[PDB]
Amino acid sequence: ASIPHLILELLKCEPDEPQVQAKIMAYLQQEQANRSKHEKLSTFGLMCKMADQTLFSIVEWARSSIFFRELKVDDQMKLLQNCWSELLILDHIYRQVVHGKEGSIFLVTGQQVDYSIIASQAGATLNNLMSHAQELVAKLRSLQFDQREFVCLKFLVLFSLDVKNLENFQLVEGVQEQVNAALLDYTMCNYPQQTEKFGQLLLRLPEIRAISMQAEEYLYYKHLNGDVPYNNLLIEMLHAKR
Amino acid sequence: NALLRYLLDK
Ligand SMILES: C=C(c1ccccc1)[C@@]12CC[C@@H](O)[C@@H]1CC(CCCCCCCCCOP(=O)(O)OCC[N+](C)(C)C)=C2c1ccccc1
C-alpha cells in the first residue's frame, strides 16, 4: 500500500466522522424537540439543515487546509462560492459508496433511510438528480474508490482552474498539478487492476459538477419562492452570486 | 456577503 506523502497531508484535514455525525443529529433532535407538531419541520426542511451543518464541516475542513489558509479571505470566499455545491454532492456520494447499500440512502448523521421512501417525496427535478447520483455511486464502487482518492477529488474541486479574479491564481495552479500528480501515481500504483481508473476518475467530476449546478439553481429558486426554510449560511450561499 | 467572511476572517 503506497501512499504519496502529499496525500498523507491531505487526509489529516478530514474531520472525525463518528463525532460530527453525533454533532449533527444531536443538533437536529433538539431543534424538533423545541417545537409542537404544528411547528415540526418537513422532510425538506430537515434535509436543508443537514446540508447546512455539512457546510459548517466543509468550511472548518477547508480552513484546516494549509494551502487554503495561504490565501486571503477574498480568494478564499471565491473558491468556496464556486465549489460548495459540488463538494456537498461529492461528500454525499462518498457516504453512499462507503456506508451505503443499493436501495438505501445514508445521511451525514449516519441515518439509513430507504431510497423509495425518500424519493416518493421529491419532485421530478430532485428524483432525476438523486437517481443520477445513485448511478455515479455505483460506478465508483466498482472502481474501488478509496478514501485517499476521495480527498484528492475534494481539493481538486476546491482549487478550481475555472475560478477567475483570484489574487494568487498561481498558487491554485500549483495545487491543481500537485494533486493531479499525486492521485495518478497512487491510483496506478495501488490499483493496477483498473489501468484506467484515474482516467475515469476525472471523468466524473464534470458529471458531479453538472448535478451541483442543477441542484444549486433549484434551491435558489425555491428560496426565492419562500419554500426554503432559513438555515443560516446556506441561505446567503445562494443569496449571494446565485 | 458578510457572514461567510466572518467564518473565514476568524
Ligand atoms: C443537495 C442536497 C439537498 C439539500 C437540501 C434539500 C434537498 C437536497 C443533498 C446533498 C447532501 C444532502 O445532505 C442533501 C440531501 C440530499 C438527498 C435528499 C433529497 C430530499 C428528498 C425530499 C425533499 C423535498 C423537496 O421538495 P421539492 O423537490 O422541491 O418538491 C416537493 C413539493 N412540490 C414542489 C412537489 C410541490 C441531497 C442530494 C440531492 C440531489 C442529488 C444528490 C444528493
Coordinates of N, CA, C and O in Angstrom, one line a residue, chain A residues 29 93 104 185 238:
Chain A
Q29 N -32.1 16.8 16.6 CA -33.0 16.3 17.5 C -33.5 17.4 18.4 O -34.8 17.5 18.7
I93 N -22.2 11.5 -2.1 CA -21.9 10.3 -2.9 C -20.9 9.4 -2.2 O -21.2 8.2 -2.1
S104 N -30.9 2.1 -0.6 CA -30.8 2.8 0.7 C -30.0 4.0 0.6 O -29.1 4.1 -0.2
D185 N -0.3 8.8 -9.5 CA 0.7 7.9 -9.0 C 0.1 6.9 -8.1 O 0.3 5.7 -8.1
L238 N -26.7 30.7 -1.5 CA -27.5 31.0 -2.7 C -27.9 32.5 -2.8 O -28.0 33.0 -3.9

